[PDB]
């Protein structure tokens, strides 16, 4: 339906033949889905195409046409030289392309953790159905409420709220939320802003609740049209890698041409320059990495996958780089540090008042879940709530001032919350108390859940509800006695500090007594005792207005005037609630200290209790002075800007803050260059999660909050954040592990060849051999390092700085130190076969350099064979050393600094596998006879393998010297 806005609700409903009260039949849904397709943009549909991608590189094509002009000149080992090079490079492509496509798929599949959802009413179920937006069809009834992301193009049928505010910004630009209505917008031309009866796919619900019919899905929606005409930013680390990418690439390209020029008049020996060119371009293919290395994205994909399987769904990828550098975590308390498993465990009422004297009737409630299964005790001895007249009224207030209920889940077997956590915990208390002595012992678990509550409800009619407001911090309900004349009453619950002041009397049993200063102070005595004690209880004071104003003397829709209607109150009692810190939080807090990350708790608790919980969880010490390190939103607002900013530098605890305080806190933190992870879940936290470095949204939270954040905690657990920061740090190490191994080995390949040229020695490795090691190393041990376990002490050092360079000075030295020795160890093995080996030696003086003058200049200073220089045995020492030293160097990259005696070779059980699998392929080109002709003949079974190993192995020892320097320096 294309003109839905201009036409009536009735016209739209009629067009799709859908019942507003019912929604589409499973059949309609089916046919409509056929007709209109899934509510999504199409997936733009690699393999063979991705292989030929690699041959588009000009340096790879230069080599192939230098191996063809070498073949065609020969035709009119070197017979099938272009045959092998092509076969290796098509395999070298697939090795590093299939690795890339796999990594990208695994990163793409992260989206399955957070699928786009929607809420439809359908014919098959009476209740609202929460299906994937993907499956939403033009025609069906949708429900949207505060915090929702509008799933498709919707014509509003009815606004169930008093007002519906929509955040259209994503589509129109109007950053102020638009008001909405049901009436038809008669102009068929009218632009989106004028379409005030329409909900646009991709937009948010800033407040209220609407019911509507889907007009257009897929590419037919307004934002779907945009995303077809829609046709960009590099993370700090990418810029420092690409920069180093050129740095490395342009050094090797200079040495590559310098190898061609060092061989001056050597073009004559057997026009002749084409050999020294293809041996200098094969280095340009082997030592220069064009396009981001495949193992980099492989270990990022694997990292984020681990994170999701830990409940940390990464929404924004670059936030994995930001995650290493985080220095501050702003966690909310009630959902995230504490379980939100709430239960009233203590309560008091007034006992005896005599002038300045005031005593209390304290009670404790056993049973800490939501089940109506426990005892009310007084002095550790069980008592019957019903005997105390105050407890009756306390229980009446808790029953009526309640928008929740309980629900016995039959299949799970346990009693379950319906309303809010705080209120269910009040329902549960009214159940345990049973102030009216109702027969409940014969009730079924299901019928039991609300029995005692529903008795009180049959005692007075709930007329209306004065809803909670942050200013007064309390809510109330107006009530008239059911049937039959005790006058109407109001029941108030809220913060103790707030409501106790609004009390003019106190209830003692069924007696009313004038509220004095000694009684007021006595009440708060225990209130403080409880919130500061072993269990940091969240107290509520429960009060009644005995004489409420006339039902028509109160404005029932204006929030601000409510507190006025909640005065002349009578204090009745207090319920102390328990909501315990999550067990891992204690230790995750400790980790953050060691990590060097500051943790700031934001709470709804009053300051005193707020501080106490911080002491409990370890944010503070049990004795620690805190006066200038914890603030309420009110206190914080009375500090001058500069002191506010200063306060943010040291504060670990913020109690009772405005929604606008989180953005302020982030901002101030930022002026000190802190990298801050903020938690949020409401429409209100959206701007603040945008401002923070790592916006962390709650899974249970609103779509809006998630859409505006980098990461969503699936399990709302604070520890999930700490785990995520570790997985962030663990990733960055695993990058530099593979980065060291790739960069040092390529420096090895450059040092290997530039020694052969700049000294004068015979060819160390042929182009067919160089491209072989460069395929086996990049194919097995390199791709195995993407699987080595998270490094050892990652969480014990301070957080990485975002201004730091990718590769430091010291690290560039380790890349050279190793890169040098590996290059020298291969050229010092082929040269060893002549000089000091027992298979036809060159002169230990220094004659091997001048191999050029032998075939013609034999009679001068030689006296030996002049064809055993191209021998098939020095080159099989240079290859065998290179492979083995690369397998040896791969063990150096299981940790950046930690020695092999603390992190053994079997830490990565898979790298050891790729060593054996690389050794099987290396031994196959030495023994299986069709091949070693095109390569070279085997190394002497036992004597020369001991030399290869005593040449290669010291590279492990060399790094251990560098690692000992490294570990014993920090």
């Amino acid at each position: 339906m294309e003109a839905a806005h201009s036409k009536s609700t009735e016209e739209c409903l009629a067009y799709f033949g859908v019942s507003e009260t019912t929604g589409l039949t499973p059949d309609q849904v089916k046919r409509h889905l056929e007709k209109y397709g899934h509510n999504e943009l199409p997936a733009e549909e690699s393999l063979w195409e991705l292989v030929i991608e690699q041959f588009e590189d000009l340096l790879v094509r230069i080599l192939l046409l230098a191996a063809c002009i070498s073949f065609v000149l020969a035709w009119f080992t070197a017979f099938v030289e272009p045959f092998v090079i092509l076969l290796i490079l098509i395999a070298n492509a697939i090795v590093g392309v299939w690795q890339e496509r796999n990594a990208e798929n695994a990163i793409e599949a992260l989206k399955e953790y957070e699928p786009e959802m929607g809420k439809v009413y359908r014919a098959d179920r009476k209740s609202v159905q929460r299906i994937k937006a993907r499956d939403i069809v033009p025609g069906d009834i949708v429900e949207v409420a505060v915090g929702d992301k509008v799933p498709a193009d919707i014509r509003i049928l009815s606004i169930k709220s008093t007002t519906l505010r929509v955040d259209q910004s994503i589509l129109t630009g109007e950053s102020v939320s638009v008001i909405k209505h049901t009436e038809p917008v008669p102009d068929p031309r009218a632009v989106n802003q004028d379409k005030k009866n329409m909900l646009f796919s991709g937009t948010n619900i800033a407040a209220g609740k609407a019911l509507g019919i889907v007009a257009t899905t897929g590419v037919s929606t307004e934002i779907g049209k945009i995303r077809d005409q829609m046709a960009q930013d590099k993370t700090p680390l990418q810029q420092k890698l690409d920069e180093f990418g050129e740095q490395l690439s342009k050094v090797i390209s200079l040495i590559c041409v310098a190898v061609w020029l060092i061989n001056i008049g050597h073009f004559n020996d057997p026009r002749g320059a084409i050999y020294y060119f293809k041996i200098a371009v094969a280095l340009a293919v082997a030592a220069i990495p064009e396009g981001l290395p495949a193992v980099i994205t492989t270990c990022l994909a694997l990292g984020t996958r681990r994170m999701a399987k830990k409940n940390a769904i990464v929404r924004s990828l670059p936030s994995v780089e930001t995650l290493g550098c985080t220095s501050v975590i702003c966690s909310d308390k009630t959902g995230t540090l504490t379980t939100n498993q709430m239960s009233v465990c203590k309560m008091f009422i007034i006992d005896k008042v005599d002038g300045d004297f005031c005593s209390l009737n304290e009670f404790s409630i056993t049973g800490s879940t939501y089940a109506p299964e426990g005892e009310v005790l007084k002095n550790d001895k069980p008592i019957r709530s019903g005997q105390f007249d105050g407890l009756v009224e306390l229980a009446t207030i808790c029953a009526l001032c309640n928008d929740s209920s309980l629900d016995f889940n039959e299949t799970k077997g346990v009693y379950e919350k319906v309303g809010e956590a705080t209120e269910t915990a009040l329902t549960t208390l009214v159940e345990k108390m049973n102030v009216f002595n109702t027969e409940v012992r014969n009730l079924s678990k299901v019928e039991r859940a609300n029995a005692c509550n529903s008795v009180i409800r049959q005692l007075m009619k709930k007329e209306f509800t004065l809803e909670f407001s942050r200013d007064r911090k309390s809510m109330s309900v107006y009530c008239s006695p059911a049937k039959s004349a005790v006058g109407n009453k109001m029941f108030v619950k809220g913060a103790p500090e707030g409501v106790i002041d609004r009390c003019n009397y106190v209830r003692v049993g069924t007696t009313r007594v004038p509220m004095t200063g000694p009684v007021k102070e006595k009440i708060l005595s225990v209130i403080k005792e409880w919130g500061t004690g072993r269990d940091t209880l969240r107290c509520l004071a429960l009060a009644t207005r005995d004489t409420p104003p006339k039902r028509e003397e109160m404005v029932l829709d204006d929030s601000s005037r409510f507190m006025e209607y909640e005065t002349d109150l009578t204090f009745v009692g207090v319920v102390g609630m328990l909501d315990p810190p999550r067990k891992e939080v204690m230790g995750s807090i400790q980790l953050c200290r060691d990590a060097g990350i500051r943790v700031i708790m934001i709470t709804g608790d009053n300051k005193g209790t707020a501080i106490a919980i911080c002491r409990r969880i370890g944010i503070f010490g049990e004795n620690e002075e805190v006066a200038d390190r914890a603030y309420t939103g009110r206190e914080f607002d009375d500090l001058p800007l500069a002191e506010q900013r200063e306060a943010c530098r040291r504060a670990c605890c913020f109690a009772r803050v405005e929604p606008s305080h989180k953005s302020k806190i982030v901002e101030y933190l930022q002026s000190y260059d802190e990298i801050t992870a903020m938690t949020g879940d409401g429409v209100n936290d959206a701007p603040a999660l945008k401002k923070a470095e790592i916006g962390i949204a709650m899974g249970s939270g609103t779509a809006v909050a998630k859409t505006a954040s980098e990461m969503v905690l699936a399990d709302d657990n604070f520890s999930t954040i700490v785990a995520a920061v570790e997985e962030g740090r663990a990733i960055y190490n695993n990058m530099k592990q593979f980065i060291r191994y790739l960069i040092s080995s390529n420096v090895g390949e450059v040092v290997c060849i530039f020694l052969t040229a700049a000294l004068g020695l015979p060819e160390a490795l042929i182009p067919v051999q160089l491209l072989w090691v460069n395929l086996v190393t990049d194919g097995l041990p390199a791709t195995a390092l993407g699987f080595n376990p998270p490094d050892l002490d990652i969480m014990d050092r301070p957080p990485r700085s975002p201004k730091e360079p990718l590769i430091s000075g010291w690290l560039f030295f380790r890349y050279m130190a190793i890169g040098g020795y590996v290059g020298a160890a291969t050229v010092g093995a082929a040269a060893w076969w002549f000089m000091y080996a027992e298979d036809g030696p060159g002169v230990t003086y220094h004659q091997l350099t001048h191999f050029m003058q032998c075939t013609e200049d034999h009679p001068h200073f030689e006296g030996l064979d002049c064809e055993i220089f191209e021998a098939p045995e020095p080159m099989t020492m240079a290859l065998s050393v290179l492979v083995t030293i690369e397998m040896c160097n791969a063990l150096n990259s299981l940790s950046e600094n930690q020695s092999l005696m603390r992190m053994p070779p079997w830490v990565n059980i898979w790298l050891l596998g790729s060593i054996c699998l690389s050794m099987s392929l290396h031994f196959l080109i030495l023994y299986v006879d069709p091949l070693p002709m095109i390569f070279k003949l085997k190394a002497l079974d036992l004597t020369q393998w001991l030399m290869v190993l005593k040449i290669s192995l010291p590279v492990i020892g060399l790094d251990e010297i560098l690692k000992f320097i490294a570990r014993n320096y920090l």
Partner: peptide, 30 residues
């Protein structure tokens, strides 16, 4: 049996591809 499973599937495919690469140089023999 999760990351360890996506491990054999990775290495064994990289080994299998190099194995065939040789048995095309080993095949091209006359």
């Amino acid at each position: 049996p999760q990351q360890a499973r996506q491990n054999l599937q990775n290495l064994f495919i990289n080994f299998c591809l190099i194995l065939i690469c040789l048995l095309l140089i080993c095949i091209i023999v006359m």
